[PDB]
Automatic annotation (TrEMBL), chain D:
InterPro entries, per database record: NADH-Q_oxidrdct_subunit (IPR053229), NADH-UbQ_OxRdtase_su21_C_fun (IPR024549), NADH-UbQ_OxRdtase_su21_N (IPR019721)
UniProt keyword Membrane present: yes
Name recorded for this polypeptide: NADH-ubiquinone oxidoreductase-like protein
Stretches assigned to the NADH-ubiquinone oxidoreductase 21kDa subunit C-terminal fungi domain: 110-181
Transmembrane parts of this sequence: 39-56, 68-89
Domain NADH-ubiquinone oxidoreductase 21kDa subunit N-terminal: 16-101
Keywords: Membrane, Transmembrane, Transmembrane helix, Ubiquinone
UniProt xrefs under Pfam families: NADH-u_ox-rdase, NADH_u_ox_C
Family annotation (PANTHER family): NADH-UBIQUINONE OXIDOREDUCTASE 21KDA SUBUNIT N-TERMINAL DOMAIN-CONTAINING PROTEIN, OXIDOREDUCTASE 21 KDA SUBUNIT, PUTATIVE (AFU_ORTHOLOGUE AFUA_4G04750)-RELATED
UniProtKB/TrEMBL annotation, chain E:
Function: Complex I functions in the transfer of electrons from NADH to the respiratory chain. Accessory subunit of the mitochondrial membrane respiratory chain NADH dehydrogenase (Complex I), that is believed not to be involved in catalysis.
Record localization: Mitochondrion inner membrane
Lineage of source species: Eukaryota, Fungi, Dikarya, Ascomycota, Pezizomycotina
Keyword Amino-acid biosynthesis included in the entry's annotation: no
Keywords assigned by UniProt, alphabetized: Electron transport, Membrane, Mitochondrion, Mitochondrion inner membrane, Respiratory chain, Transmembrane, Transmembrane helix, Transport
Residues of the full protein shown: 23 to 121 of 121
GO cellular component: mitochondrial inner membrane; respiratory chain complex I
Name listed for the protein in its UniProt record: NADH dehydrogenase [ubiquinone] 1 alpha subcomplex subunit 13
Membrane topology classification: Single-pass membrane protein
UniProtKB/TrEMBL annotation, chain F:
Alphabetized InterPro entries for the sequence: Nuo9.5
Family annotation (CDD domains): NI9M
Annotated segments matching region Disordered: 59-78
Species this protein is from: Chaetomium thermophilum (strain DSM 1495 / CBS 144.50 / IMI 039719) (Thermochaetoides thermophila)
Top-level lineage group: Eukaryota
Protein name: NADH-ubiquinone oxidoreductase 9.5 kDa subunit
PANTHER family assigned: OXIDOREDUCTASE 9.5 KDA SUBUNIT, PUTATIVE (AFU_ORTHOLOGUE AFUA_5G08980)-RELATED (PTHR38488:SF1)
From TrEMBL, chain H:
Superkingdom of origin: Eukaryota
From-to range in the entire protein, with total length: 87 to 143 of 147
Protein name: NADH-ubiquinone oxidoreductase-like protein
Length: 558, 103, 169, 187, 99, 78, 114, 57
């Protein structure tokens, strides 16, 4: 269904050079991703560690289908940023259910809604996003070495093309260029990793590789050394893609350069798909009996990366003045918790890994919506800061500085508290969802003798909490540097709005000012839901946590 | 190797060795007896031997140095010519075939 | 030795060691490629059961049937020397004309159909051996019993008739 | 007569709550064994797509030019129809897979097949494809409706590799033939 | 000038292209049948040819097993299984024929 | 000037043939294959044209037990 | 020795024999204005080693991908008897997805330099 | 669990159908017996559970 949607959307896009069709191509992509969810929900009535599909090249697991549906739902939420205009004129006179469904409002809205903005004029943008989803979804379902390479390239190439999609932006072309070049080096390690596996084992299926690893584990001419250190080179190419230290220098630079609406998809989706693929490959290749092979485990790279990502992520973020250079370092410290949970291969660590990855994806999505919404809210605000006049690509990245958020509690108080809750959830403060995620990973690692990494993680969290608190200190401790625009609220200039009925007949005409302009509901409702999930997780915890208990029991059963 | 599809449109040389190893694993290993898969250790070594030929290269190497050193020590009386080897098994070259066999 | 086709072979290794006295001895087939193709349909007309028995023996000893089907192999060789001698005691001019034609025509049966028809008739009237090809389409005349060959470089004389056993001239 | 062997290929066992009828059921069987709810749900699902795009248009107009919405409905109409049929197909085949309640399908399968077995016809039909190409096709499409959201696939090959022992069908037909002979005697 | 009228040239082209597709149906159908004859002729020869090849393989295997038990004293087991494996490597003398 | 396909599909087909022949007839030729696939094989079988049996590309190993043959044994050599 | 290798030998020695004759038996009098670039009689700015505008680079980008696509069809044309209907279907799906990308190139007018 | 269950047991049916040497493919009759038993055991087990629900009507 994802491919049928790609081919159908590509056929309509191919006969149109009309840029006014971009908003509607994006709304159709949201309907298409909702059919993929219905199909994936229908496929969840079986219990199994895996069923080979299409000649053994692909496979389906309950874990596979849960993660595809999550990828499809995250994608629907990100797609909202290109399928609805950022600002909406709302009036109490046009607020009933009868009014919404049977009455029309006419006013000049090109400037108020930013109809001809860059995020509203790229025609192929929802089409290229579907390509990354398709690559992400196959990679979860891959069963073969050749399948792995093709799917990670389909994911990677579309991410390069999304980073360069703003062609008239020098900043985006550079982030796209850096990402493509360094990601091409990343794929050369993945290809070398797969090639050495096939060259030494004669097989291309992971299912066959797992059996060779399992027989080999006992307690004289062919010792299976190649498996661990072919998987090590294989793993290094994926630690780049998730941006784990010391292969993380690229993401702070690229995330800050590309447009913010683009950075939300580019920085979230690839992590979800790669960590799920690595999870099942970590489980099958674990040796249940300690031997010489266990001394050379490729999973040691995952512990080095988690140890480094915890240290690098929290320390280098201390002196980051750029909001998006800071979110990347924040992610680098969070993938350290994900990597540490993944490296301890235990029922408790696998539940902790599943739950941390889902909650951080929804929480990091909340941060990006708030950032994107705080920017669009500055339309009726004016500033005189020499620093905010020297910023580049202000349309693609409206908020680029932490200082630009100074005094935002005095401009939008509840939107600022939404960001405060999301940031406090990144710190790990109870009773927010991020505390429970972090303490589940700490639990599992404590129970498995990884005491030293648990001590490192808690110490880095206090270091990482320093720059989190600096964001909140700017939003609440200082006065705003943004003032209301004097012309858009002057009590002498207003625009006129007509309210029409079901058949083009005037009911009443109203004269409106800049105080009658608000954030469009798709972005306020989305932020409201994710904020409330973070806040009240302690009351809605049972089904979500029990989903991961069952998925992990299946993976460890039989 | 393990695919079953070789270069000539026929099956791969190490496919019987791979099918035997998988058959051994499924027919001996289970959750009830984890250590039943130790039966697969010789079967898994044969699959690698079919693939890389390290054990056979070591056998021929030892046998070839042993063979050659005996040839030098062996008494030599008359070496067959290259043309005489070509004549073995022909229509009307009974004399040469006999000389090749020292008969 | 390996079934891989060599790309850098410059040397041939021969063993003059004979098979041990334990294994019975079979004199090998002496026909060349052209005589063997000209008599292949006769092989299978008489030796099919033994040709099929040796193959089912090897499939019944997977990986080991070389050593464990040596008697069935000796039997197929004997069955095949029997037809060759039979095609030599009788029908020897026809047999030679066919396989001598086949060597000059890239060993392509459709390029020597008149010599095949003459030999096939002489084999039939002295050995009761017929050329049978399985699963040929019933809608059309068998290709080896067709007057005109579309891929034959020389057209078949109108006066040369295909051999169909039973029906007279 | 009895084929003397009823499981010839190694199949994958999936833990499911209902009896497995066919791991690779032919396209026509999926459509024939479809319940009338399956046409009700698949028609509602196909209408949902364009109706979603209509509702988004009424509440939040896209501000598109004169012919754009009609173009977008044609894409939303197809994508909804395409996903509606995939949803309609999945409901019927999950019952063949034993992944949905299938008592009705289990009983029509046990009659249709025992009707083919008493008639001497092949259980799953005759393929024009070779027996190895039939296997590649069984391997490609078995349990393939569980990947419908990503890559779709349908079985259009009359192969004989469906994951079930066929002995039950031959057992019933002979017992049905046993009862037929005794009934025919009293005539 | 009707030598250059688009219609009669379209007609004569459709005739020639339809006639040549008829001849192609007959040709390939005949060749697929010639291919069946070449394969059945090969199949009758396979069991006498393979039988001579197997006698040579058993004879060369037995000789090398005897040569090792002399040169190396005992036989080295390359494979754990009892199955015959066609040799990838062979002992060769230090010199070719003198010619 | 140019016809819209959904406004009038038959008018668009005439314009595309006359004014964009290379592209229009590419779609006709390409579509003719699936039409050939769906219609010729039924008519071919209706008229009795039978698809031929596949030629053997491996030795045809017969099924069933071995035939327990007696002939061409070692004593028949001389 | 094989004919193919000997063929490569000869064509190389013919390229040498012609080249050697001219390098030995022809006059050689190189001087300043003889060794200058042709520009129809008047010297101009040397600009052939500076970045130049190619207005058909989008055609080179597409040619690379389509070259890969027709290469992935050559195995099918030499394997049709075995592929049959089941293999023809996949080859048609492959061509059909590739054709949609070509329709994108035609509709977006990428190949229509003005 | 330290035991791998093939996600794709149908890999036992792989291998080229052409140019096959006689005696090349290993007999997998013990393998097919195994998988037959898993299928018969799963369906048997399912048939008992559904009958229990009818008894609890
Ligand atoms: C229909 C034909 C049509 O509209 O022709 C006129 C069409 C443009 O005419 P127009 O009047 O300028 O269109 C105005 C608007 O663009 C309005 O045009 P539109 O976008 O409303 O219609 C274009 C048409 C294009 O799509 C088709 O023609 C469907 C095929 O349909 C669509 O794009 C929407 C339906 C998509 C169906 C996708 C089915 C395949 C994917 C799933 C595979 C499984 O010209 C074409 O050549 C389009 C057809 C392309 C055929 C591709 C053939 C190769 C396929 C491989
Ligand atoms: C976990 C927790 C899960 C959730 C638990 C439940 C919590 C409660 C959730 C309630 C959500 C709101 C539901 C109602 C709603 O949308 O009201 C908005 C809004 C209330 O605000 P308003 O300012 O009065 O709206 C007028 C403005 O002009 C509005 O103008 P505008 O231009 O600003 O845009 C208006 C409209 C434009 O949109 C439309 O025109 C339609 C959009 C809705 C389509 C509905 C399709 C229904 C059929 C579906 C298939 C069955 O867009 C929206 O308001 C939709 C916002 C959707 C935000 C995302 C919500 C779903 C995702 C949840 C995120 C979860 C994240 C955490 C978890 C992550 C994963 C684990 O009401 C309407 O728009 C009226 C229509 C309501 C829906 C149609 C009802 C009649 C249907 C036909 C009979
Ligand atoms: C463009 C769209 C073209 C659509 C099809 C055109 C007409 C095809 C012939 C026809 O009348 O079809 C029905 C016709 C019925 O014949 P019958 O003698 O009444 O019934 C025989 C039995 O089915 C039992 O059959 P059997 O076991 O005796 O023999 C097996 C079967 C062997 O046939 C097969 O096994 C066909 C393989 C079907 C694969 C299904 C894949 C579905 C998902 C597609 C994924 C798309 C990814 C994006 O042999 C045939 O029936 C011969 C069929 C004709 C040659 C095969 C090629 C036709 C399909 C071409 C599909 C690709 C077109 C381009 C797509 C471009 C996409 C961008 O043949 C089929 O069953 C083939 C159906 C193919 C459906 C394709 C997918 C539709 C969704
Ligand atoms: C704010 C916290 C809220 C927590 C909500 C989630 C809690 C768990 C939900 C588990 C869930 C949704 C998965 C969504 C995942 C989204 C991504 C992750 C989101 C994390 C927030 C999957 O449930 C799966 O969970 C797995 C692990 O528990 C099990 O293993 C699977 O067997 C199970 O189906 C729903 O379980 C259930 O859904 C219903 C639907 O109708 C299914 O109904 C059936 O579907 C067809 C047969 O599919 C049938 O034909 C159809 O007739 C019937 O209708 C059920 O059969 C069952 O599937
Ligand atoms: C966590 C959220 C997972 C999604 C969810 O709640 O799915 C429930 C359900 C799952 O589907 P469903 O299985 O309830 O669909 C109806 C099935 N019958 C008719 C048999 C009862 O979601 C939907 O109904 C809508 C599917 C598309 C959703 C797109 C995103 C919103
Ligand atoms: C053949 C045997 C040698 C004959 C040439 C001897 C002297 C040639 C001579 O002076 O040529 C002057 C001129 C060129 O003399 P040149 O001295 O200006 O040549 C310069 C090239 N180097 C520096 C390598 C010497 O020769 C010709 O242009 C004619 C050559 C003979 C052509 C006859 C047919 C050839 C086929
Ligand atoms: C006809 O009466 O006499 C021959 C005619 C000469 O011209 P005229 O007499 O004026 O024809 C009048 C036609 N209304 O001329 C003709 O009518 C002959 C027209 C052509 C007839 C068929 C030619 C051969 C078949 C077509 C070949 C392939 C064409 C396409 C390939 C090339 C494309 C570049
Ligand atoms: C560029 C290339 C593409 C464009 C091609 C354009 C040319 C048009 C022709 C397309 C192909 C037509 C092939 C010819 C059809 C044909 O030969 O049908 C033969 C077939 C059976 O007839 P058959 O058994 O061969 O007759 C033997 C008589 N002794 O007849 C049938 O079974 C059915 C015949 C009617 C259909
Ligand atoms: C039905 C008619 C289909 C062909 C339509 C046609 O002739 O071209 C339409 C159009 C070019 O003309 P256009 O730019 O629309 O001119 C008016 C401006 N609005 O072209 C377009 O807008 C679309 C560009 C591509 C259209 C298809 C061209 C051929 C596609 C490749 C070969 C297809 C054949 C192989 C695949 C099988 C197809 C079934």
């Amino acid at each position: 269904m994802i491919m049928i949607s790609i081919l159908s959307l590509l056929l309509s896009t191919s006969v149109t050079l009309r840029r006014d069709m971009s908003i509607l191509f994006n709304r159709i992509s949201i309907i298409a991703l909702a059919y993929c969810i219905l199909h994936d929900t229908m496929s969840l009535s079986f219990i199994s560690k895996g069923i080979g599909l299409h000649g053994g090249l692909l496979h389906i697991t309950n874990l596979t289908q849960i993660f595809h549906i999550f990828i499809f739902i995250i994608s629907i939420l990100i797609l909202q940023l290109t399928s609805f205009y950022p600002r909406k004129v709302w009036i109490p006179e046009y607020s009933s259910l009868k009014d919404i469904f049977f009455n029309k409002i006419l006013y000049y809205r090109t400037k108020i809604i930013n109809k001809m903005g860059e995020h509203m004029k790229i025609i192929e943008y929802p089409l290229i996003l579907l390509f990354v989803i398709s690559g992400a979804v196959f990679l979860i379902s891959t069963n073969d070495l050749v399948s792995i390479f093709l799917s990670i390239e389909l994911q990677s190439y579309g991410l390069y093309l999304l980073s360069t999609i703003y062609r008239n932006s020098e900043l985006s072309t550079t982030g796209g260029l850096i990402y493509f070049l360094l990601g091409g080096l990343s794929s050369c390690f993945i290809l070398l990793g797969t090639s050495l596996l096939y060259v030494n084992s004669g097989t291309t299926s992971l299912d066959g590789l797992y059996i060779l690893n399992s027989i080999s584990d006992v307690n004289s001419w062919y010792k299976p050394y190649y498996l661990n250190f072919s998987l090590l080179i294989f793993s290094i190419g994926f630690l780049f893609k998730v941006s784990a230290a010391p292969f993380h220098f690229w993401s702070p630079d690229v995330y800050d350069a590309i447009p913010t609406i683009v950075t939300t998809f580019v920085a979230i989706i690839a992590k979800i798909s790669i960590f799920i693929f690595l999870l099942e490959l970590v489980y099958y290749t674990n040796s249940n009996a300690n031997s010489y092979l266990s001394e050379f485990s490729w999973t040691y790279a995952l512990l080095i990366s988690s140890l480094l990502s915890l240290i690098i992520g929290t320390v280098v973020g201390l002196t980051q003045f750029r909001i998006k250079r800071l979110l990347a370092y924040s992610t680098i410290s969070h993938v350290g918790f994900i990597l540490l949970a993944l490296s301890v291969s235990s029922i408790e660590s696998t539940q902790a890994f599943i739950f941390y990855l889902i909650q951080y994806s929804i929480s990091n999505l909340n941060a990006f919506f708030i950032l994107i919404t705080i920017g669009f809210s500055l339309y009726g605000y004016v500033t005189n800061n020499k620093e905010y006049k020297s910023l580049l690509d202000k349309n693609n990245s409206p908020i680029q500085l932490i200082s630009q958020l100074k005094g935002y509690f005095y401009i939008n108080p509840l939107l600022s508290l939404s960001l405060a809750i999301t940031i406090f959830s990144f710190v790990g403060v109870p009773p927010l969802v991020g505390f429970f995620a972090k303490q589940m990973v700490l639990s599992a690692a404590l129970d498995n003798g990884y005491i030293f990494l648990s001590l490192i993680a808690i110490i880095t969290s206090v270091i990482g909490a320093v720059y989190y608190l600096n964001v909140i200190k700017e939003i609440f401790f200082y006065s705003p540097e943004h003032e209301v625009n004097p012309v858009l609220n002057e009590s002498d200039s207003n625009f006129s709005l007509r309210i029409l009925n079901e058949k083009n007949v005037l009911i009443r005409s109203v004269l409106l000012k800049g105080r009658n302009i608000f954030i469009s509901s798709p972005f306020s409702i989305t932020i409201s839901i994710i904020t409330n999930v973070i806040l009240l997780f302690i009351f809605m915890n049972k089904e979500w946590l029990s989903m991961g208990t069952i998925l992990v029991q299946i993976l460890f059963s039989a | 190797m393990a695919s079953g599809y070789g270069l000539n449109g026929g099956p791969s040389r190490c496919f019987p060795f791979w099918q035997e190893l998988l058959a051994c694993y499924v027919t001996n290993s289970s959750e009830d007896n984890p250590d039943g898969k130790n039966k697969c250790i010789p079967v898994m070594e044969d699959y690698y031997e079919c693939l890389h030929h390290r054990k056979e290269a070591a056998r021929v190497r030892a046998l070839q140095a042993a063979y050659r050193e005996a040839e030098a020590k062996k008494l030599q009386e008359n070496p067959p010519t290259a043309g005489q080897i070509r004549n073995l098994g022909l229509l009307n070259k009974e004399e040469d075939t006999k000389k090749v066999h020292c008969a | 030795m390996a079934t891989r086709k060599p790309a850098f072979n410059q040397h041939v290794l021969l063993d003059t060691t004979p098979l041990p006295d334990s294994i019975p001895k079979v004199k090998e087939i002496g026909a060349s490629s052209a005589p063997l193709l000209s008599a292949s349909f006769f092989i299978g007309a008489r030796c099919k059961d033994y040709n099929d028995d040796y193959m089912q023996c090897k499939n019944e000893n997977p990986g080991r049937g070389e050593f464990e089907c040596l008697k069935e192999g000796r039997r197929v060789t004997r069955c095949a020397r029997s037809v060759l001698k039979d095609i030599n005691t009788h029908c020897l001019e026809q047999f030679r004309a066919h396989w001598q034609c086949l060597d000059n025509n890239n060993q392509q049966l459709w390029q020597c159909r008149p010599a095949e028809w003459k030999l096939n008739k002489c084999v039939y009237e002295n050995l009761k051996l017929e050329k049978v090809i399985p699963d040929q389409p019933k809608n059309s005349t068998p290709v080896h019993l067709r007057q005109r060959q579309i891929f034959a470089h020389h057209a078949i004389p109108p006066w040369e008739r295909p051999f169909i056993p039973g029906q007279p001239e | 007569n009895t084929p003397t062997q009823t499981y010839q290929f190694p199949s994958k066992t999936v833990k499911t709550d209902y009896p497995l009828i066919d791991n690779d059921p032919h396209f026509t069987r999926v459509i024939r064994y479809a319940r009338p709810s399956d046409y009700a749900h698949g028609l509602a699902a196909a209408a949902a797509g364009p109706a979603a795009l209509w509702l988004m248009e009424r509440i939040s107009p896209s501000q598109v030019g004169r012919g754009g919405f009609a173009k977008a409905m044609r894409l939303a109409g197809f994508i909804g129809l395409a996903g509606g049929f995939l949803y309609f197909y999945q409901r019927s085949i999950l019952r063949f897979y034993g992944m949905s309640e299938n008592a009705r399908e289990v009983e029509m399968d046990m009659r249709e097949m025992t009707d083919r077995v008493k008639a001497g016809l092949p259980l799953y039909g005759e393929s024009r494809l070779s027996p190895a190409m039939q296997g590649v096709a069984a391997r490609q499409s078995r349990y393939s409706a569980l990947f419908f959201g990503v890559m779709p696939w349908f079985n259009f090959v009359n192969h004989n590799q469906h994951g079930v022992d066929t002995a039950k069908y031959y057992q019933q037909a002979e017992r049905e033939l046993e009862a037929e002979r005794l009934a025919r005697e009293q005539a | 000038r009707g030598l250059f009228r688009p219609r009669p040239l379209l007609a004569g082209a459709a005739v020639l292209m339809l006639y040549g597709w008829y001849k192609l149906v007959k040709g390939i159908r005949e060749q697929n049948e010639l291919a069946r004859e070449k394969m059945w002729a090969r199949i009758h020869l396979i069991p006498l040819l393979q039988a001579e090849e197997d006698r040579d393989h058993v004879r060369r295997y037995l000789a090398d097993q005897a040569r090792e038990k002399g040169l190396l004293g005992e036989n080295i087991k390359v494979y754990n299984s009892d199955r015959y494996v066609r040799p990838t490597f062979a002992v060769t003398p230090s010199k070719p024929a003198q010619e | 000037t140019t016809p819209r396909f959904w406004s009038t599909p038959l008018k668009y087909c005439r314009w595309a043939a006359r004014e964009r022949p290379a592209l229009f007839f590419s779609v006709v030729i390409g579509a003719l294959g699936p039409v050939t696939l769906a219609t010729v094989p039924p008519l071919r079988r209706l008229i009795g044209d039978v698809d031929a049996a596949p030629i053997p590309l491996t030795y045809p190993i017969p099924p069933g037990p071995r035939k327990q043959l007696k002939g061409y044994d070692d004593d028949t050599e001389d | 020795m094989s004919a193919m290798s000997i063929y490569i030998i000869f064509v190389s020695i013919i390229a040498i024999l012609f080249l050697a004759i001219d390098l030995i038996f022809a006059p050689h009098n190189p001087y300043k204005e003889k060794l200058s670039a042709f520009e129809c009689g008047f010297h101009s700015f040397s600009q052939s080693r500076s970045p130049f505008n190619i207005s058909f680079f989008i055609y080179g980008l597409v040619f690379l991908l389509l070259d890969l696509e027709i290469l992935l069809l050559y195995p099918f044309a030499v394997s049709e008897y075995v592929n049959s209907a089941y293999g023809l279907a996949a080859a048609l799906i492959f061509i059909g997805i590739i054709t949609i990308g070509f329709v994108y190139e035609l509709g977006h007018d990428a190949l229509k330099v003005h | 669990s330290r035991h791998i269950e093939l996600k794709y047991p149908e890999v036992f049916s792989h291998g080229s159908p052409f140019n096959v040497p006689a005696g090349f493919y290993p007999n997998l009759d013990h393998v097919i017996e195994h998988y037959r038993k898993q299928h018969l055991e799963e369906e048997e087990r399912k048939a008992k559970k559904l009958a229990a629900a009818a008894a609890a009507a």
